[PDB]
Symmetry: D2
Subunit: 496 residues, 4 copies
């Protein structure tokens, strides 16, 4: 059975990234299901620490540790064992009363805070990975389009000539600062609250640094009230998701206007478009509009989380709103979809140039030329060139057909003076590619200038990957250190 | 004429910080009025750069520069001269057609983006200053209350014994990370978009680094589209304001419950409370509730800004929502109010201890003691101590009156076993001050532990002030460098 | 295996309404799964109309209709058949090419709009039913507490004496107007957009009134663009959910303060409270705080939906955010939980009176008495009674112990005059029950006055149920009319 | 001095409605300044009622009433007299101690609730008036464009032929239901809370119905807690503003795409457009984008208000967020701007038809024709016509040039079968005006069908005006009844 939506002009199959937008909602875990594997990690690291502190004997330790493995297996199919006390009770039924001792010096409150941090921690790197791939496809696309002349818009009106490469490097700079936000958020997420217990700590002499290290955290949430009542990192995670996706919505909306029947300066790859069940001509931007949908929805968690913090005291509280897996999954699906939209986007290079040359986006350079050649001030030249456009439209003369005749008519009709410029000065001022080449300062569409943007972005991307690789390896090292600590206590007992 | 609200129990005058909450709304500038002084700075720095680049002659430069001073003076009283083109026209009426030349290689789009950045830049340091003073008063208050034993709450129910100093240091850690957010936001605000012109740059060979340096920016918004279309720093500024104020709302709500007629573990200073026009007994937390009001309202700008970015393309656009001065002013008033609330808060040290000793918040230490002394597991001891509380309530026995009799009754009625502990073990387990001293790990209420929190916070506060002092001095140096550059071009011309 | 959270003071089982708060998230349908049964209804009603219009022959009709029954059965287990085109394709595999003809004069756009309306329609009555039961429990509780004297609060400070019945009737009036909002929303939801097709209608001569009637709608979405682009009813549904839940949050927060260890003027029924895994004394308001959580989260869909409408044109669009089943399910769970909280709430009638008599909430009646007896103006009497409270607190004299001595001291110390009132006048002015009885105007706590509130509410509740019963019966009648129309076309063919 | 922005292509003056968008922010009142005139009305109506109830003597009454007139005059210039207690104190300085007696049986709490209701009440009719004028201009524009053939879009892609009149009547139906929302909100606003006093009523025997009638309310907020704690009407007012403005944003965005350089199917009237200070060609949609800006910002108050209700108990509270005058003023400015945009919009009737005839929006009628003539099912015909479009694009053949040749090629290449239709059948199926005429059902673009929409809308508009006229006259009658009651008590005393 094929994909029944691939009919008419919806040829071939949905690109996999496009398909993600249809799958994430039904496939997303509940928060309980997504966090409960991290709870089992906290159990292991927490009783290991209890053992090294002489709160548990090695016998008690190994009995518990080996029991956790069994219950984890039961929990893979028994949904009811994915919250703490049911899990603790099942451990009691499996290894005896000693199970109770894994909760010494600990609460559900700091267990939850730490476990949810670990979940968001991993989802953050998953996001940074997706945003990097988004930026990679964007920069890489720019590299192939240093000569693709097109108009840039302001207020949805043709403004001035640029190149597609120049435009995409605006996205790259946007994504660079969003990657900064995510890395800055990571440092505030990756702090361990374990040891706070209910909110005030405990008399049992725990080693809070050891539990934190064993679980991959880079530091402690020191104060014990902050440990269970702190939630700003959840709010901030929701925010960056929303602000980043707003930038993604804007790109999707930009490409959607490019790919209108009326602009047609770009076309979505068949694998990122759908069609209508009634209208055979449709090539619909389903990828774009469902990506925007995810960006609009991401404001929900943000508002819910902040409402909840504004509604309580600075306590642990069960009334706080969470950032849900399904919300992150939507972000990932949309980032992936737009990563593939950018990569496979088909610009109509020729109609792009036509617009740049015919639709008067070159009138600024005409104005600048008068100022630079005869020395009149900008505001007066502006009025001359403005009336040139008024006249050219009335008479049906496209920008690239405007001549010395018309510029003199306007200068006279608007000032009584003629003006000292050749037909060559004008022709060159109205050349869209010459508009591009003259804009060669830092951050401007000239190829030499955009290539410099790309060179810096490539180096920043190299550094982005290095940061991600280091943060991932840190967590894997600590996850292995903890696995080894457990095996050793299980072996130490069995052999003595 | 006195303050007519200072009647009945509202004795003395409103504290100045309390009064701010009543004044900021009517006194706040419009965005136009707050930004237009920064536009005049951009004019000076921009034509200076034009001069150093040989786009303007020194004659033209000095004529413009001296004209700006005159129009700035006209604009101090003429409201209509506070947007660009009216201002440019007034300069035309004052120094002639040369006025037009100050707009060479420039647009309203990058002028606005840069000017608004400069406004938010200054408002950010104003905020960091207020948050520092908020943290100072919080830490300083904690220092004076290492021995003030009281209960901490979870879910608005007495949880465990702590000290007021311990609680306030949770706020300090919250404010430390909010100061991090603000400093991280600052780096993204303090980038100069000038040179982007309409969105694509210009043919005029500007020195974008020189304009940026003259205006105090620490770097460039490189890509020209990002220069006029970038808005995330506005969204982020709204966010941090909201997340920080949510933490302030939670403290205000905490103190408001402390200061209820029913808790009465704290009392607002008379200078931060009001009263009723009908009910003479009222001592109302007007300071607290108006501070919360500002925190709730701060979600508005956040949502409006993000809706607006989600609604457009990645272009310059006049449909984007701003962060308004009145919104920042509310934040400042609320931070100041809570700074004074914390400083002058009057804890009822005695009723605080009474609650800690009588209302069963010490039952965890009773449970931990059974586990540590007879070795039973936590879950079983929990059930014993739980039934102890059930029984003690039925019989009207406060926590500090619970005896060996009752613990044995419960252990028997719940297990058939007695349990091996002296009346001394129990008495000490139920001592609230001993609950505090036993919690001596990192971040726990023990005085030695809280004092360590305070010592680290003092050093972080020292560093916070250093960062602020450096960022302020940087802007003042660049503002003086620009004033000198202008004088020199005005002098150079007049003497040659 | 029991509920492992029912330990310590969490005696017995969670009340079923309390349990709902733990089950709704994992049990909620996806929007696709919840809507696809309504699509099959639209298919039947739509081809019936096609048949009555002579667009389909009876042979074609019966073949399709009988095929739908088969595919509906396949779709009960095959998830992929729950979106239109996969469903249409499966019908093609089951009855032949004639399947295609069920889409004549129709689009996915108006199919979706109508189907989602039908889903929200049913969820709206489900909500009105839950809000009625919420109001019933509230009014019924008030009836049993016309004599339960207690303080009302303003700004979380004891204000004046009332009764619990009086308080609950404020909730009743709040819920009455929310029921109005829901009934007003219903009329805007229950309009049929079918016939709009893609957005512009169709040449096929459909009978739009017949399809609308067969599916239970009370009218048409006339204009065809409005039919597929209209979404305000979704926004409004999200809004009423949020505003109603805000009122529910406020009640939950009120009861949570009542039930604090410090107030203890109320206690949650054991079946609506939990406890701590570490602190044995806790009786935690898990029901209340998870109900508030749902209210905070309900702002998310509202913001997402409105962001999405603000981001598009007035077109059909796949970028619009929906109101999800899981969001409604949370509302229902919270309404049910609070319905049971109110019903089983245990007021401590005695400590309620103690507060009313001892904590100075009766000082208004003392003030009013001076004004009514000696004729001084309110503002001066206020200052006398205010200083009475200042003095009484200093000296430790509770309100019900204030005597003629103290009132004369204050009147003298504050004016030099004594004042003409007996010790009986005062004693009666400070009697909290007499404060209640004197407040006998419309909407005031006097029993005769609250009983009148209750009498009107009972009649409004009777009318609320009548409205709901009528709206439900209307849908059931139309659902049966459609079932009969289908059977007849299936019988007509098989017998001819 | 002219408007300095009217340069270049920004010819003539800003239309007044366009200018409103620039003036409302700086001109908006504070909430205090906007409400304090309604407080003086409540004072008059409240002491009149006190007099008729024998709580005040006629001497006391007239002294107060005449004093209010004097203080109202002082308050016109003294800003400090615009909150209650300062105002009461000034009355004390003007007529003596009797001033205090105007507060008998009353609080600031119910004074504020009632006064703010009166302010929102008037602002609601102001809004309903503006929305009516918005709908009038929309319907009236439709009437003039029953023959203006153009494409409708779905997902920003040309869908099917319609007329501009048809499109505008979708807006009319949207605005009709928004007018319903506002009228339904009005009934919940126009209820009088006076008599609630602080929250519990009073012993003084007020006539709550008399005060309510004198102030124009149509009923009572009965329960006294609801009187001061009720706020949902504020939330709802913010909501309808946001949902209505979202519909206005969508129209503004639709017209902005119409008026792009690439579509150019419409052009803004010169009086609703601006231009660039750098780019002479720009004709910028400043009216549209600033109207959208107001719609995005309107989500702020909504979120702030609902956060605040979610954060408190069901009490009077000073932490609740208000709906501000400046927020309503923005709505009014935007409604007025779009009212004039619609009225003066210039459709390019000819390019509209060109698109409808050339860009394949007529392929549905081609498909429907095959189904209606040879009897094949829709899905197969769809695939034929789809490949017709694929082929026509490849070969550069516009829709209106597609012939019998091409339809047979596709039918063969896609099925091996030819198909039985004449070149006349095809030509007529591809005629955009014939597409319009065939869509003649209820709510479809056929002139006879749209004219019926217009006829019903005109009658609904007539009824909208009647409702508004009645609600305005009711308030004016009660405002005169109150003015007469005051004069009579002032005359009665002076003559006796
Ligand atoms: N591609 C999903 C959008 N719905 C189509 C209509 C349809 O699929 O019946 C459209 O408007 O193009
Ligand atoms: N202090 C402002 C709150 N309003 C008072 C009532 C009043 O001032 O009439 C209260 O509820 O205490
Ligand atoms: N009843 C869930 C709240 N968590 C408990 C702590 C715990 O369960 O370990 C409390 O703070 O009371
Ligand atoms: N008409 C306000 C928008 N700003 C112009 C640029 C400018 O005015 O310098 C534009 O982008 O067209
Ligand atoms: O028209 C639909 O129901 C699906 C649209 C989409 O694929 O996004
Ligand atoms: O009751 C008022 O109107 C003022 C309250 C406040 O001072 O916040």
């Amino acid at each position: 059975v094929p994909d029944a939506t691939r009919i008419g002009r919806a040829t071939g199959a949905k690109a996999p990234e496009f398909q993600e937008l249809y799958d994430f909602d039904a496939a997303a875990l509940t928060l309980t299901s997504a966090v409960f594997p991290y709870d089992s990690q906290i159990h292991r690291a927490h009783v290991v620490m209890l053992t090294e502190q002489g709160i548990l004997t090695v016998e008690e330790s190994a009995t518990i540790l080996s029991g956790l493995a069994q219950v984890d297996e039961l929990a893979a199919t028994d949904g009811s064992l994915r919250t703490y006390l049911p899990y603790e009770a099942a451990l009691k039924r499996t290894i005896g009363s000693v199970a109770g001792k894994m909760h010494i010096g600990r609460s559900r409150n700091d267990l939850a805070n730490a476990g949810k941090r670990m979940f968001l921690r991993d989802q953050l790197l998953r996001t940074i990975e997706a945003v990097i791939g988004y930026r990679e496809a964007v920069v890489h696309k720019a590299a192939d389009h240093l000569d693709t002349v097109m108009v840039v818009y302001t207020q949805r009106k043709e403004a001035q000539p640029i190149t597609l490469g120049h435009y995409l490097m605006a996205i790259s700079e946007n994504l660079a600062k969003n990657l900064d936000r995510y890395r800055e958020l990571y440092a505030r997420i990756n702090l361990c609250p374990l040891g706070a217990a209910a909110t005030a700590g405990t008399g049992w002499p725990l080693n809070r640094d050891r539990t934190s290290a064993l679980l991959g955290f880079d530091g402690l949430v020191v104060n014990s009230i902050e440990g269970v009542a702190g939630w700003d990192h959840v709010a901030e995670h929701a925010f960056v998701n929303a602000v980043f996706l707003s930038g993604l919505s804007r790109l999707a909306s930009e490409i959607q206007l490019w790919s209108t029947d009326e602009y047609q300066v770009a076309e979505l790859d068949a694998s990122f478009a759908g069609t209508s069940s009634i209208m055979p001509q449709k090539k619909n931007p389903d990828s774009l509009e469902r990506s925007r949908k995810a960006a609009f929805a991401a404001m929900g968690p943000l508002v819910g989380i902040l409402t909840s913090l504004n509604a309580i005291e600075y306590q642990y509280s069960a009334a706080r709103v969470e950032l849900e897996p399904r919300s992150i999954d939507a972000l990932i699906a949309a980032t992936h979809a737009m990563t593939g939209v950018v990569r496979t986007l088909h610009p109509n290079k020729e109609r792009m140039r036509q617009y740049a040359a015919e639709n008067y986006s070159t009138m600024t350079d005409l104005t600048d030329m008068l100022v630079r050649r005869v020395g009149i001030d900008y505001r007066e030249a502006h009025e001359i060139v403005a009336h040139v456009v008024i006249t050219a439209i009335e008479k049906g003369i496209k920008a690239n057909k405007i001549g010395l005749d018309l510029v003199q008519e306007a200068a006279v009709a608007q000032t009584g003076a003629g003006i000292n410029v050749s037909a060559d000065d004008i022709k060159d001022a109205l050349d869209p590619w010459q508009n591009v080449l003259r804009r060669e300062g830092k951050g401007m569409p000239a190829p030499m200038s955009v290539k410099a943007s790309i060179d810096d972005a490539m180096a920043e991307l190299h550094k982005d990957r290095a940061w991600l690789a280091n943060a991932t390896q840190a967590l894997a090292n600590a996850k292995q250190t903890l696995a080894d600590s457990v095996q050793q206590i299980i072996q130490t007992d069995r052999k003595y």
